[PDB]
């Protein structure tokens, strides 16, 4: 499969941003999808995840300010964030896992290239 | 030179010719009324046309209608009237019958694809197979069947090409017939293969997490497993899942194990932890594995039957995840009689009740500690009531899969009835393609050509006998 991301750059503090990630699979592509972030010189953190409907997970530090949506007609994920804070300047990756129904331990995870998001409070 | 050649086979005396005519008329009328009954009970039911899995039923009935009404029409123009049909009318009639058969085969094609997506990709079924996509696919199949039927009407009759053409079908060229029968035969054999594969693979996988494949008893298997891990008997706890921060709370479990390590009940609490991932959590798990003798950590990849053996041997299973969209691990644990102590997040909220396990808060080592000591206290009494309650709860989540298997069995039955009905007829066209024939083969052609109308007769009987929802909808009208 192949994943393409869009929406990176610099954002003024307090603003909002849309990130888009599109996947090219053969049968529904990814069963579950998610957004990861990596601060410079820090480990990756789970910031968003969704499969369908009301199966959304946001971390405790981004709950109430990050919303995730999935479009199934084009097989893509959108991340909306608002009221950005300057600890969110990170490289964002798009992760897409297919998981097997017969065996819950099996899973295949695929990754995007990642886009740099720099939120700046400088006036 | 005419459609509906009944003047052949002069054995039929006038004492029985009227009997043949009236039985053909009553059979055609019966098929038409059955098919319109199927359509009207489909269209007067909200729950039947809203499910794409039943859509082909309507399609199948419509195809059978194209074999019914045309037959009745063709039976009126030769006995009741005596209108000799031209080339155009014969072409239209033969095209209608061929379109009926090709639409039946294509409806079985789309039904087989829908069955595969429903059974063997259940997570992707409710998002791939939508009503507009199914309607579009059925319309495309019907239109391609119509086009390939009406091709001789557009200039593919045998008098146009000035070449040799068939004798049992005047004004029908040989090449069109062999191409049509080749397409239909190839599609039919593909559908037989597809249904066989769908029913075969789903048999070995739908019923896998059950104690019927596990020998011995509970305590004997637990003792053998703990001796295999170099431990004594005791209350056993299990974790299986990914080693990462954010998805599954393996670090929550490790913190809880560290907290219980300082207490006086840790000698009666064995722990098994299976998984792999980031090296830091792996190192923490290995450090707790070497610090205490009653904590076992496995990293290597395991077989599915080994996990089935593990689920029915241990007493409790801990699922302290943060994001669980499906909770298949809880289903596999509870099907084999393993009481879960899980986090109330995601799909784990609506699977474990207050009598089928213990629920904790997400990412709470203290609450996990309290629940695990409560489970230790609860394990002192008998536990078979909780095991049977968890088995009854988890077996109730596979009811949709069993109905999908039953629908696939019904579809295999419809396919083999269609195969039996249209087999010898298409075999007569095969033998027409390779070699000539005498009048006896044309006679048995005319005799076995009523199997099409018989197939149209017996399809609604199968629909009424198999489908409980269709039966209840039919009983809702009166
Ligand atoms: C020349 C000939 N075979 N025509 C007859 N019957 S018949 O008039 O000979 C005849 C009648 C009655 C009886 C009896 F006794 F059983 F009642 C016997 C023979 N059909 C019947 C059958 C059909 C089924 C559905 C719709 C329309 C027609 C058919 C046919 C099928 C498939 C293809 Cl691809 C081509 C054609 N053609």
XYZ file of C-alpha atoms and ligand atoms in Angstrom:
638
model
C 0.000 0.000 0.000
C 0.983 3.656 -0.319
C 0.123 6.634 1.885
C 0.368 10.335 1.028
C 0.117 13.187 3.535
C -0.658 16.881 3.126
C -1.119 19.882 5.407
C 2.294 20.557 6.981
C 3.921 23.916 7.558
C 3.926 26.788 10.031
C 0.828 27.847 11.978
C 0.321 30.917 14.159
C -0.495 30.039 17.768
C -4.181 29.682 18.569
C -5.056 28.789 14.980
C -6.480 25.656 13.405
C -5.185 23.201 10.825
C -6.356 20.314 8.642
C -4.101 17.349 7.883
C -5.038 14.842 5.184
C -3.697 11.333 4.607
C -4.778 9.167 1.673
C -4.135 5.435 1.305
C -4.088 3.213 -1.790
C -5.146 -0.315 -0.844
C -6.855 -3.157 -2.666
C -9.688 -4.133 -0.284
C -10.849 -1.231 1.963
C -7.171 -0.523 2.570
C -6.621 0.059 6.272
C -8.983 -1.324 8.890
C -7.801 1.143 11.555
C -5.943 4.408 11.005
C -4.131 6.879 13.200
C -1.969 9.953 13.468
C 1.331 9.907 15.367
C 3.527 12.834 16.352
C 7.243 12.983 17.101
C 8.753 15.977 18.849
C 12.399 16.703 17.923
C 14.544 14.405 20.032
C 11.539 12.650 21.591
C 9.739 9.340 21.167
C 6.606 8.932 19.061
C 3.247 9.447 20.757
C -0.230 8.301 19.778
C -2.173 11.488 19.123
C -5.182 10.212 17.149
C -6.843 6.962 16.144
C -10.075 5.818 14.470
C -11.612 2.801 12.763
C -15.188 3.950 12.009
C -18.072 5.835 13.587
C -17.629 6.658 17.270
C -14.375 4.701 17.617
C -12.168 7.755 18.066
C -9.257 7.925 20.492
C -7.408 11.114 21.367
C -4.658 11.309 23.956
C -5.219 12.973 27.324
C -3.084 15.948 26.240
C -5.048 16.516 23.005
C -8.547 15.545 24.118
C -11.101 18.226 23.280
C -8.809 19.956 20.767
C -8.137 17.200 18.187
C -10.850 15.590 16.062
C -10.378 12.763 13.573
C -12.584 11.831 10.631
C -12.465 9.145 7.959
C -13.815 9.368 4.414
C -14.502 5.892 3.037
C -15.357 6.938 -0.529
C -11.751 8.059 -1.066
C -10.220 5.999 1.807
C -8.566 8.892 3.627
C -8.263 10.381 7.110
C -8.540 14.028 8.171
C -7.178 15.489 11.403
C -8.613 18.801 12.587
C -6.779 20.603 15.363
C -7.490 23.976 16.933
C -6.065 26.149 19.720
C -2.546 24.958 18.996
C 0.119 25.172 21.711
C 3.861 25.427 21.027
C 4.696 21.949 22.365
C 2.897 20.562 19.291
C 5.732 21.471 16.886
C 6.417 17.945 15.695
C 6.800 15.668 12.703
C 3.416 14.021 12.148
C 3.172 10.528 10.675
C 0.161 8.704 9.266
C -0.113 5.095 10.449
C -2.506 2.554 8.962
C -2.991 -0.911 10.459
C -4.904 -3.853 9.040
C -5.811 -6.394 11.708
C -6.880 -9.998 11.219
C -10.263 -11.135 12.523
C -9.226 -14.760 13.064
C -6.217 -13.950 15.269
C -6.235 -10.776 17.353
C -2.444 -10.754 17.772
C -1.801 -10.336 14.033
C -1.542 -6.814 12.624
C 0.215 -5.069 9.742
C 1.175 -1.416 10.172
C 2.148 0.948 7.363
C 3.585 4.437 7.638
C 3.739 7.735 5.807
C 6.677 10.059 5.308
C 5.509 12.618 7.861
C 5.007 16.379 7.658
C 6.610 18.999 9.881
C 4.185 21.173 11.858
C 5.686 24.247 13.534
C 3.285 26.349 15.596
C 4.778 29.710 16.548
C 3.617 32.254 19.122
C 5.902 34.947 17.683
C 4.046 38.137 16.765
C -38.405 -21.747 -38.611
C -40.682 -20.730 -35.741
C -40.275 -20.363 -32.004
C -42.404 -22.736 -29.872
C -42.228 -25.784 -32.133
C -44.825 -28.102 -30.571
C -45.961 -29.688 -33.868
C -42.920 -31.977 -33.615
C -43.214 -35.278 -31.690
C -46.532 -36.364 -33.256
C -47.060 -39.026 -30.509
C -49.225 -36.413 -28.734
C -52.768 -37.371 -29.687
C -55.502 -34.701 -29.414
C -56.689 -36.544 -26.293
C -53.445 -35.392 -24.615
C -52.451 -32.319 -26.662
C -54.991 -30.224 -24.757
C -53.621 -31.715 -21.529
C -50.087 -30.637 -22.489
C -51.378 -27.170 -23.388
C -53.265 -26.714 -20.121
C -50.386 -28.007 -17.969
C -47.956 -25.657 -19.719
C -50.386 -22.756 -19.251
C -50.914 -23.525 -15.558
C -47.170 -23.930 -14.964
C -46.422 -20.614 -16.670
C -49.189 -18.833 -14.765
C -47.961 -20.370 -11.503
C -44.400 -19.170 -12.183
C -45.625 -15.653 -12.978
C -47.716 -15.457 -9.798
C -44.864 -16.815 -7.642
C -42.418 -14.313 -9.110
C -44.739 -11.330 -8.686
C -45.397 -12.562 -5.143
C -41.649 -12.534 -4.449
C -41.278 -9.023 -5.893
C -44.228 -7.601 -3.974
C -43.169 -9.100 -0.652
C -39.660 -7.719 -1.251
C -40.867 -4.216 -2.115
C -43.439 -4.072 0.714
C -40.726 -4.937 3.260
C -38.385 -2.241 4.542
C -35.903 -4.702 6.056
C -35.312 -6.697 2.863
C -34.389 -4.086 0.247
C -32.331 -2.125 2.788
C -29.943 -5.090 3.061
C -27.737 -5.504 -0.043
C -27.224 -9.195 0.789
C -30.849 -9.874 -0.201
C -30.794 -7.661 -3.322
C -29.975 -10.496 -5.727
C -33.188 -12.265 -4.599
C -35.148 -9.588 -6.426
C -32.695 -9.805 -9.321
C -33.049 -13.584 -9.468
C -36.828 -13.371 -9.443
C -36.777 -10.724 -12.172
C -34.599 -12.987 -14.301
C -37.019 -15.856 -13.763
C -39.846 -13.514 -14.755
C -38.122 -12.965 -18.094
C -38.283 -16.721 -18.563
C -41.891 -16.968 -17.444
C -43.908 -14.247 -19.194
C -42.070 -14.617 -22.519
C -42.859 -18.344 -22.461
C -46.537 -17.622 -21.826
C -46.485 -15.003 -24.579
C -44.766 -17.422 -26.929
C -47.371 -20.048 -26.064
C -50.281 -17.781 -27.066
C -49.019 -16.739 -30.499
C -48.871 -20.328 -31.777
C -51.946 -22.085 -30.305
C -54.427 -19.326 -29.418
C -53.279 -17.321 -32.418
C -51.365 -18.715 -35.374
C -49.068 -15.766 -36.044
C -45.911 -16.932 -37.788
C -42.997 -15.074 -36.221
C -40.565 -13.143 -38.402
C -36.806 -12.976 -37.871
C -37.151 -9.987 -35.521
C -39.618 -11.678 -33.151
C -37.611 -14.922 -32.986
C -34.462 -12.900 -32.281
C -36.250 -10.954 -29.538
C -37.588 -14.120 -27.881
C -34.255 -15.955 -27.924
C -32.520 -12.818 -26.662
C -34.978 -12.551 -23.787
C -34.420 -16.139 -22.664
C -30.623 -15.860 -22.949
C -30.732 -12.566 -21.027
C -32.732 -14.286 -18.281
C -30.121 -17.022 -17.879
C -27.149 -14.641 -18.046
C -28.737 -12.344 -15.457
C -29.272 -15.350 -13.175
C -25.581 -16.275 -13.462
C -24.474 -12.682 -12.876
C -26.717 -12.321 -9.832
C -25.062 -15.437 -8.421
C -21.694 -13.806 -9.224
C -22.460 -10.656 -7.250
C -23.987 -12.726 -4.436
C -20.787 -14.795 -4.181
C -18.630 -11.656 -4.005
C -20.911 -10.171 -1.330
C -20.747 -13.417 0.663
C -16.942 -13.436 0.573
C -16.737 -9.820 1.752
C -19.342 -10.452 4.461
C -17.823 -13.614 5.920
C -14.063 -13.424 5.425
C -13.632 -9.632 5.727
C -16.240 -8.761 8.378
C -14.558 -5.506 9.400
C -14.578 -4.162 5.833
C -18.041 -5.436 4.886
C -20.201 -2.637 6.280
C -17.996 -0.009 4.584
C -17.246 -1.689 1.233
C -20.596 -3.280 0.379
C -22.971 -0.313 0.348
C -26.447 -0.094 -1.139
C -25.540 2.343 -3.999
C -22.484 0.287 -4.975
C -24.502 -2.944 -5.018
C -27.303 -1.305 -7.024
C -24.779 0.063 -9.538
C -23.062 -3.329 -9.880
C -26.385 -5.121 -10.401
C -27.438 -2.559 -13.014
C -24.118 -2.966 -14.847
C -24.496 -6.761 -14.834
C -28.084 -6.523 -16.100
C -27.094 -4.106 -18.866
C -24.156 -6.207 -20.054
C -26.438 -9.274 -20.091
C -29.014 -7.293 -22.094
C -26.368 -6.113 -24.583
C -24.873 -9.571 -25.130
C -28.417 -10.895 -25.580
C -29.470 -8.247 -28.119
C -26.268 -8.484 -30.205
C -27.924 -10.603 -32.985
C -30.673 -7.981 -33.258
C -27.981 -5.413 -34.134
C -26.740 -7.368 -37.147
C -25.345 -10.701 -35.953
C -27.875 -12.972 -37.641
C -26.578 -15.752 -39.856
C -28.145 -14.484 -43.086
C -26.112 -11.272 -42.769
C -22.717 -12.986 -42.583
C -23.624 -15.334 -45.497
C -22.118 -18.289 -43.620
C -23.346 -21.591 -42.211
C -25.578 -21.323 -39.147
C -27.359 -23.608 -36.708
C -30.279 -25.901 -37.521
C -32.040 -26.033 -34.139
C -31.941 -22.212 -34.151
C -32.768 -20.666 -37.536
C -31.380 -17.144 -38.054
C -28.812 -17.718 -35.274
C -25.156 -17.839 -36.253
C -22.769 -20.442 -34.876
C -20.082 -18.054 -33.604
C -22.498 -16.057 -31.441
C -23.827 -19.247 -29.852
C -20.398 -20.661 -29.021
C -19.192 -17.309 -27.651
C -22.276 -16.933 -25.436
C -22.102 -20.487 -24.095
C -18.364 -20.118 -23.452
C -18.881 -16.929 -21.436
C -21.719 -18.450 -19.402
C -19.860 -21.725 -18.750
C -16.674 -19.925 -17.649
C -18.621 -17.689 -15.268
C -20.558 -20.673 -13.868
C -17.429 -22.715 -13.141
C -15.850 -19.670 -11.487
C -18.910 -19.317 -9.245
C -18.794 -22.993 -8.255
C -15.120 -22.547 -7.330
C -15.802 -19.329 -5.398
C -18.666 -20.746 -3.332
C -16.659 -23.894 -2.579
C -13.722 -21.809 -1.338
C -15.967 -19.499 0.717
C -17.734 -22.380 2.461
C -14.510 -24.347 2.956
C -12.411 -21.567 4.489
C -15.198 -20.327 6.752
C -15.721 -23.805 8.176
C -12.200 -24.042 9.606
C -12.171 -20.495 11.005
C -15.636 -19.614 12.349
C -15.402 -22.301 15.050
C -11.804 -22.127 16.278
C -11.982 -20.570 19.762
C -13.848 -23.308 21.621
C -12.948 -25.813 24.328
C -14.110 -28.720 22.135
C -10.607 -28.753 20.608
C -8.962 -28.780 24.060
C -8.479 -32.050 25.932
C -8.144 -32.614 29.658
C -9.778 -30.451 32.298
C -9.239 -26.986 33.773
C -6.920 -27.564 36.735
C -4.904 -30.308 35.025
C -4.224 -28.091 31.998
C -3.348 -25.154 34.263
C -0.929 -27.317 36.268
C 0.691 -28.650 33.087
C 1.056 -25.111 31.706
C 2.551 -23.754 34.935
C 4.949 -26.702 35.197
C 5.897 -25.952 31.584
C 6.777 -22.425 32.769
C 8.588 -23.689 35.878
C 6.029 -22.481 38.426
C 3.756 -23.978 41.053
C -0.035 -23.815 40.951
C -1.857 -20.614 41.772
C -4.158 -17.933 40.466
C -2.886 -17.240 36.952
C -3.166 -13.991 34.998
C -2.456 -13.401 31.319
C -1.721 -10.519 28.963
C -1.311 -10.777 25.191
C -0.885 -7.822 22.866
C 1.463 -5.258 21.414
C 4.329 -3.743 23.417
C 3.882 -0.021 22.818
C 2.940 3.192 24.599
C -0.466 4.565 23.673
C -2.391 1.630 22.211
C -2.255 -1.119 24.856
C -1.384 -0.504 28.479
C 1.442 -2.992 28.879
C 3.209 -0.352 30.995
C 0.063 -0.107 33.136
C 0.298 -3.858 33.705
C 4.007 -3.614 34.545
C 3.335 -0.816 37.051
C 0.556 -2.916 38.596
C 2.907 -5.909 38.858
C 5.497 -3.696 40.570
C 2.843 -2.433 43.003
C 1.629 -5.952 43.854
C 5.249 -7.098 44.254
C 5.378 -5.105 47.518
C 2.298 -6.848 48.967
C 1.763 -10.086 50.870
C -0.447 -11.789 48.254
C 2.062 -11.835 45.374
C 2.895 -15.499 46.041
C -0.610 -16.495 44.864
C -0.488 -14.460 41.620
C 1.306 -15.890 38.595
C 1.671 -13.716 35.498
C 2.196 -14.487 31.807
C 2.952 -11.610 29.421
C 3.166 -12.175 25.656
C 4.176 -9.552 23.126
C 6.936 -7.656 21.384
C 7.633 -4.051 20.494
C 9.804 -1.174 21.676
C 13.049 -2.194 23.431
C 12.429 -0.156 26.604
C 9.159 -1.869 27.536
C 10.684 -5.205 26.521
C 13.610 -4.484 28.838
C 11.288 -3.550 31.700
C 9.320 -6.778 31.194
C 12.539 -8.824 31.099
C 13.793 -7.094 34.259
C 10.585 -8.028 36.074
C 10.962 -11.535 34.618
C 14.415 -11.905 36.175
C 13.515 -10.095 39.416
C 10.570 -12.363 40.301
C 10.267 -16.061 39.591
C 6.481 -16.004 39.159
C 6.398 -13.605 36.175
C 6.994 -15.085 32.712
C 7.544 -12.937 29.611
C 7.415 -14.374 26.081
C 8.589 -12.305 23.108
C 8.704 -14.738 20.175
C 5.840 -15.141 17.721
C 3.276 -17.733 18.787
C 0.872 -20.020 16.968
C -2.882 -19.520 17.162
C -3.523 -22.939 18.723
C -0.973 -22.167 21.443
C -2.949 -19.038 22.353
C -6.141 -21.129 22.306
C -4.491 -23.509 24.777
C -3.386 -20.549 26.908
C -6.858 -18.970 27.054
C -8.536 -22.109 28.396
C -5.774 -22.805 30.924
C -5.332 -19.499 32.781
C -7.895 -18.101 35.210
C -7.962 -14.406 34.263
C -6.962 -12.245 31.294
C -5.999 -8.578 31.671
C -6.736 -6.212 28.775
C -5.656 -2.764 30.073
C -5.690 -1.097 26.673
C -6.290 2.566 25.909
C -7.785 2.200 22.414
C -9.621 -1.051 21.643
C -11.845 -0.584 18.572
C -12.962 -4.209 18.300
C -11.867 -6.238 21.323
C -11.228 -9.480 19.448
C -8.830 -10.492 22.234
C -11.731 -10.292 24.702
C -13.914 -12.442 22.435
C -11.212 -15.092 22.057
C -10.549 -15.086 25.809
C -14.213 -15.288 26.837
C -15.082 -17.995 24.289
C -12.582 -20.346 25.969
C -13.662 -19.557 29.528
C -11.224 -16.919 30.773
C -12.636 -14.205 33.037
C -11.496 -10.780 31.774
C -10.281 -7.895 33.909
C -10.288 -5.249 31.211
C -10.361 -1.511 30.621
C -13.745 0.077 29.882
C -12.735 1.711 26.603
C -13.873 1.387 23.004
C -15.402 -1.934 22.055
C -14.602 -3.390 25.476
C -17.392 -1.349 27.095
C -20.314 -3.160 25.455
C -18.972 -6.726 25.518
C -18.203 -7.327 29.232
C -21.147 -6.907 31.587
C -21.080 -6.719 35.387
C -21.373 -10.525 35.631
C -18.959 -11.433 32.804
C -15.761 -9.891 34.163
C -14.296 -6.853 35.898
C -13.965 -3.349 34.444
C -11.239 -0.846 35.337
C -10.405 2.728 34.433
C -8.044 3.376 31.535
C -4.392 3.844 32.470
C -4.872 3.387 36.234
C -2.295 1.106 37.915
C -3.992 1.646 41.277
C -7.431 0.684 39.981
C -5.896 -2.282 38.157
C -4.260 -3.296 41.448
C -7.580 -3.041 43.295
C -9.377 -5.063 40.617
C -6.657 -7.718 40.538
C -6.741 -8.160 44.332
C -10.548 -8.289 44.158
C -10.231 -11.000 41.500
C -7.742 -12.828 43.730
C -10.297 -12.735 46.556
C -13.063 -13.871 44.180
C -10.981 -16.816 42.918
C -11.041 -18.405 46.397
C -14.641 -19.540 45.838
C -15.884 -21.450 42.801
C -15.654 -19.774 39.406
C -17.640 -22.031 37.044
C -20.641 -19.681 37.077
C -18.479 -16.870 35.700
C -16.967 -19.223 33.101
C -20.378 -20.330 31.837
C -21.642 -16.731 31.849
C -18.629 -15.577 29.815
C -19.077 -18.484 27.392
C -22.767 -17.627 26.963
C -21.917 -13.955 26.427
C -19.108 -14.535 23.925
C -20.903 -17.244 21.951
C -23.749 -14.739 21.456
C -21.423 -12.493 19.416
C -20.988 -15.104 16.663
C -24.703 -15.308 15.808
C -24.354 -12.983 12.799
C -21.541 -15.140 11.411
C -23.673 -18.288 11.662
C -26.524 -16.601 9.795
C -24.022 -15.547 7.123
C -22.918 -19.188 6.807
C -26.570 -20.244 6.525
C -27.168 -17.668 3.783
C -24.084 -18.918 1.924
C -25.441 -22.475 2.203
C -28.767 -21.267 0.776
C -26.923 -19.627 -2.115
C -24.992 -22.824 -2.831
C -28.338 -24.651 -2.870
C -29.790 -22.124 -5.345
C -26.678 -22.428 -7.526
C -26.799 -26.222 -7.649
C -30.547 -26.242 -8.419
C -29.824 -23.829 -11.285
C -26.960 -26.079 -12.427
C -29.209 -29.163 -12.381
C -31.972 -27.374 -14.295
C -29.831 -25.750 -17.011
C -27.170 -28.470 -17.335
C -28.507 -30.777 -20.060
C -29.903 -27.855 -22.077
C -26.537 -26.123 -22.397
C -25.079 -29.584 -23.041
C -27.379 -29.843 -26.076
C -26.032 -26.505 -27.294
C -22.501 -27.871 -26.694
C -23.224 -30.913 -28.845
C -24.789 -28.595 -31.434
C -21.490 -26.693 -31.552
C -19.445 -29.893 -32.007
C -21.251 -31.982 -34.605
C -24.750 -32.229 -36.033
C -27.704 -34.140 -34.570
C -30.803 -36.084 -35.530
C -34.427 -35.321 -34.671
C -34.229 -37.307 -31.416
C -31.732 -34.845 -29.937
C -34.010 -31.983 -30.987
C -36.868 -33.881 -29.330
C -35.018 -34.204 -26.021
C -34.012 -30.542 -26.431
C -37.696 -29.605 -26.580
C -38.481 -31.989 -23.713
C -35.773 -30.759 -21.314
C -36.274 -27.100 -22.237
C -39.110 -27.055 -19.673
C -36.482 -27.373 -16.923
C -36.017 -23.595 -17.218
C -39.636 -22.994 -16.234
C -39.215 -25.660 -13.551
C -36.235 -23.708 -12.160
C -38.391 -20.580 -12.124
C -41.009 -22.641 -10.267
C -38.666 -24.000 -7.603
C -36.664 -20.847 -6.809
C -39.407 -19.111 -4.700
C -39.971 -22.393 -2.840
C -36.301 -22.348 -1.805
C -36.606 -18.667 -0.861
C -39.640 -19.345 1.338
C -38.158 -22.489 2.898
C -34.737 -21.102 3.809
C -35.126 -17.430 4.739
C -36.729 -16.814 8.131
C -36.961 -13.058 7.504
C -38.721 -13.547 4.160
C -41.086 -16.055 5.784
C -41.911 -13.568 8.545
C -42.459 -10.798 5.988
C -44.827 -13.055 4.039
C -46.676 -13.892 7.261
C -46.937 -10.156 7.993
C -49.297 -9.494 5.073
C -52.178 -11.580 6.430
C -37.989 -24.972 -29.669
C -38.330 -25.245 -28.245
N -37.680 -26.251 -27.659
N -39.235 -24.509 -27.645
C -39.591 -24.707 -26.344
N -40.640 -25.461 -26.006
S -41.547 -26.259 -27.060
O -42.512 -25.360 -27.630
O -40.789 -27.086 -27.958
C -42.388 -27.316 -25.932
C -43.389 -26.801 -25.122
C -43.982 -27.618 -24.176
C -43.590 -28.944 -24.031
C -44.205 -29.812 -22.981
F -44.738 -30.921 -23.483
F -43.323 -30.217 -22.071
F -45.177 -29.196 -22.312
C -42.588 -29.440 -24.856
C -41.985 -28.635 -25.806
N -38.825 -24.016 -25.431
C -39.080 -23.978 -23.994
C -37.900 -23.149 -23.456
C -38.334 -21.817 -22.870
C -38.220 -21.567 -21.509
C -38.578 -20.336 -20.988
C -39.052 -19.343 -21.817
C -39.171 -19.580 -23.169
C -38.814 -20.810 -23.693
C -37.095 -22.960 -24.715
C -35.706 -22.472 -24.769
C -34.929 -22.422 -23.616
C -33.628 -21.953 -23.659
C -33.104 -21.533 -24.860
Cl -31.466 -20.942 -24.916
C -33.849 -21.570 -26.018
C -35.149 -22.041 -25.969
N -37.727 -23.289 -25.790
